[PDB]
Symmetry: D2
Subunit: 394 residues, 4 copies
């Protein structure tokens, strides 16, 4: 009903305005990154073959490095997903006898395969004699500092930090919480490399992990940083020598990041990055609206409408009952709205994905998969319409 | 200053909210047009060669027709600009001895060569013995209804209506005003064809001209309906019989709109149209912000922040050349592309005065993106409009003000 | 059988070598056109929006103008076919009360609609008070000079000449024959504009029509000049003022040829044009092979294996009997070889098209439509394989 | 002179005909692989995002697998060069404590950093405790069979075979020679994996290495199999189990080859592969023409015009720096792109001597197109090879000869 919406929208308005203040601040950050890097229409021209001397590619990378406050970045179609970006960081820096310690609990399913927990013999970190372990989180979702200290050894080269919750039933970690865990691990071993899986958190806060001490980060271009325009990809941002090592893994030793034809992907990647702060804000404002609206009809939601926000994720715990709502999201989507989803094989996961989008699997666009994790939306308007209609079914 | 912004943003907030209500209504309209036409990822596939049976292309046109409430539409990368879409409408429908009557005064100057009022032998309406004349507007900007009646004759096949003011010193015409003039010309001749140049007006109001009686409309995809994503293009929407004639002009007679490969443009056109209501709202909210901000520093704004809105146009008159040029430059300096390439007064072919143009955009000449331009002459009126995000506009305009205040 | 092929290939070899001499000469013509125009990788960059100052587009046009020996050219995706290019020439130059006289008989069907013979009221030349008539050919296929003289009036602004036969049962006109008719009409009225529909004839001979006196020519990019790489389009080449008039028709008066975004079509158009002489040669050598092979099994063919060649067209008069051969060509094609064609609606024609190609409707690729008109083939090898298999069925 | 050309072209004509017989056989092989896999225009459609269930991509790979007579293949724009395809094969299959043995002598220098013989800590085979060594060739260029037997051990998981000579002073290895060495290593260990770097050898002979026993091969799409149309890419073909491991290395473990959007590259890859046998023949016929022409003017050619051919490589040794540099320049001057940008001896990272490179091509670094390069030092050997048409090669080489004779 309209009445409820006037009530709910009035209620969340001061928090929507704060989100718009962050949006403006992050629009300026990015706008100034383009200015500092002298972005020109010349930087959108395609490169072919080996891709040597592609200034457009190099300049996009420098723009990302400036926004994320890192010395360098790798932003390319050659990186095919968020997972491939993350995996490029792990094999790029880790060597036989090194250990990787995930301090934020067990990471999202697909990493289980990359590290070697599942799918042994396929070229995982274990297959190359690189160790891995994770530190379970406490009952309330905080990290376990004394156990973290106990599991760091002289062979611990890297500390992994997953910012966003994914499907975990724990809260996503805010920048401040990440800073706290970074100060802790660096106190114990100042030479340990801190890596943050940053997916879904780009532009949600004023800061990103490198400025609070992360050495290297990675993420997906079909989420926040793509602005809904990047057709594929991932990014890596961090210290120069670490990005160089990622590049030798992405291509080959000797060559590295100097090669890789950009083809026709530059314009959209630049434009998308420029739009990212604003589109991320739409997703966050829609998340708050969704959280608030679902709460009105009794549905459990997490984070609640007035909770701190660090990423795009919004869960809505029905705990079948949800079927009419996830399918309802697809039905309020622009693409394949008539193709009602169901449970099926999702490559890299052992276990109803609403994905009526312009780009296959992109999730900065309105999506719903599950307690349905209902995130994204390129416009605040689309999210309000879709959620209002989905609720009006359930 | 941030304090002045606090005042202006709170002052204009009720109207920014009204704009967002329109954006949601227009987002739903488009979202439901996609769903009615069963848009699938199958419709983004490229076509090569002749482009026959390109379902993606034909579906996009049906989506446009549904949103605009017309029987048909022609939306193609082959239409190279808004002007090319309008000219296609004019030559597609008009034949020797027919007369076209523009009732909203003299149209934007590039239609001059198309109708035959400037240059000779280039293949204008005059070269093909098609007549043209415009009815001047009354001193306050309203149409002159008695003269409209006087100038309509049995040879009048088409009535032209330019919605947006462009550079003309007159208010843009709201849907309500456009409905008024449609009712008037239809009462004189129910079979006269009414055409509305709809550029910059798309999604600014709840309605478009066809639903208030317009027979056919045209526009540019590098403005409102492109959503900032369309790289080129134009659209034509209206009665099927008329759209078919437009198609024979755009390609050739016989074949018409059945032909035309889409190549790689479908995705951006669909996505751009879906984002159009929202992006248009950003442009409108930034215009109101520019109008209210500039008024606080004693600079004349037209339209004023609380005026009704039907298109994206927004000007500020500085009455000082140095301030106009510095503001324009400051807009370029606050744009994402070529921000380091500051404009100056340049010679424009055909005009006696220099023009200044801030256009640091992703797409060349695209105007749903933030731009600033105007002729260097009294009253030193700069058109500061467009913007893909309300954020970019606020940042750019706040900085531009800091340069000249 | 292999034996027959050794016999037939030996027989046509001196004529295949002559075709390769023309190919080399035309490869040099084009190579030197690129050199004279300083073609650089900079000329392949995409333009967006209005397309103003697109040097890549302008340079491609100048390269075509140099190859065809004309002052200027219009080569763009904005021209959607050979017919649209031809029609742009007719409406571009003709005005009310002018007459167009086709001296090579009735042109290909679709032009009937453009001129106004069929489809009246759709914006044809007649609808804009431009007259048209054609001069029938003599029983043997030669033009009728005394009748041509009789039908030229003081209102005749343009003389149309269709080089290729199309579906007509007459021979295609060689450059020499075209020169003869040009000298004749210019003797009668030196101010008459000569226009040649040049489709299928590009690079088949040492010369093109402008060098023998044609004022303006037009053709299709999905035939000879595209090299099999152009995804769509047409071209117009001729005197500067005439090309300017074509441009005002293609876009609008005032603007003209200075506008029209190139998007991603430049690289393929350049590369295709560079490959055109060589690919055209493959098509001609395959035509000769086909003509020779069909004659071995008694099938009437025209032109015969040893006839003069001016275009890619090869007819093979069975006069049902042909069904197993046109469908046989599709079945020896790389794309949709399993989709056996049949008779159906061909937009712009009132009356079994084999079109298993990379580009929809492209005919520099091996195609067969009908007396089956069997032309094209991007490689001489493909044509030999396809024809040998098609014959082995019939 | 035209007279010398008359002599050379008639002299080499029987062999040019042999090359064309191979081209027709190879054109039929590919044409039948398209037909076996039911290639439709549906397979050229772009995929975005994750690229899951991209039938166009999966079908192209099946087409490659059919042509190469392997169980599977990986052909992707994500493979950025031939070197990247080979490295993907090496890291995809090798694990700590395994040893790779190159039996055709020291491979092309960029594999040095990949195996760990140059540079440290970049993530080479050595950094992951994978062993490597090469068996030098006998003085005449044949492989050293006794040493091959000696160096193979229980740790030897893979045998490397570089078909093309590259810049090495030794003949390229024909399919027949490659079969000989495969039989030899398989007789020592039937389970040893045989890998063949197949670059420049595609469609030059009737067979490829897998059908003579090679377990897996790799190459570059900007060489032979690209047909001059592929803008970037690499391919890997071989046993399914091995191709799967390569896929996990190229993307990530678990996911592997199921992921990777094709974007806009499918059409050119299919069309390029279809044209590959024919374009390769142009390159081979031009090489023979260059070899015979240069021999007539007293310039040493290697290979000679009547030598067997297994790859596109062709060199001419001038024994004079000025002639080598002028010839190379003349090749640039006779190329379609950047013909006005003449090369000179340049510094190449890692090498002590200057290198000269004529590369006026449509695609950057593409070598199925006509190029000319070599180190500036005795015996002043220039590699003049590739060419999309036999016509371009004849024109360019005839002109280059006129500059130095």
């Amino acid at each position: 009903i309209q009445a409820i919406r006037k009530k709910v929208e009035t209620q969340i308005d001061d928090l929507q305005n704060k989100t718009d203040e962050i949006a403006e601040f992050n629009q300026a950050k990015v706008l100034d990154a383009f200015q500092e890097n002298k972005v020109s229409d010349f930087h959108f021209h395609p490169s072919t073959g080996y891709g040597y001397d592609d200034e457009g590619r190099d300049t996009l990378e420098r723009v990302y490095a400036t926004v994320f406050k890192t010395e360098a970045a790798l932003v390319r179609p050659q990186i095919i997903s968020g997972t491939h970006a993350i995996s490029t960081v792990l094999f790029g820096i880790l060597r036989p006898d090194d250990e990787l310690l995930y301090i934020t609990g067990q990471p999202y399913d697909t990493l289980e395969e990359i590290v070697g927990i599942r799918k042994q013999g396929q070229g995982s970190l274990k297959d190359f004699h690189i160790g891995y372990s994770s530190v379970p989180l406490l009952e309330n979702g905080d990290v376990d500092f004394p156990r973290i200290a106990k599991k760091m050894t002289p062979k611990t080269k890297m500390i992994g930090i997953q910012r966003s919750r994914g499907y975990a039933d724990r809260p996503s970690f805010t920048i401040e919480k990440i800073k706290e865990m970074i100060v802790f691990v660096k106190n114990i071993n100042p030479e340990v490399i801190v890596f943050v899986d940053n997916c879904y958190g780009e532009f949600v806060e004023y800061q990103e992990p490198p400025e609070v001490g992360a050495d290297i980060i990675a993420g997906s271009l079909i989420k926040n940083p793509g602005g809904g325009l990047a057709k594929t990809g991932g990014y890596i941002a961090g210290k120069e020598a670490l990005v160089d090592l990622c590049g030798y893994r992405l291509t080959t030793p000797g060559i590295g990041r100097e090669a890789g034809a950009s083809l026709y992907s530059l314009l959209e990647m630049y434009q998308g990055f420029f739009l990212a702060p604003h589109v991320t804000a739409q997703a966050i404002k829609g998340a708050r609206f969704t959280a608030a609206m679902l709460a009105e009809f009794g549905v459990e939601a997490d984070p609640v409408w007035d909770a701190p926000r660090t990423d795009l994720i919004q869960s809505v715990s029905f705990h079948e009952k949800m079927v009419a709502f996830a399918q309802a999201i697809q039905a309020a989507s622009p693409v394949n709205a008539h193709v009602l989803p169901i449970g099926a094989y999702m490559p890299g996961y052992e276990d109803i994905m609403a994905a009526g989008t312009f780009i296959q699997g992109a999730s900065l666009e309105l999506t719903a998969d599950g307690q349905l994790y209902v995130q994204g939306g390129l416009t605040y308007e689309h999210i309000k319409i879709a959620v209002t209609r989905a609720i009006q079914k359930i």
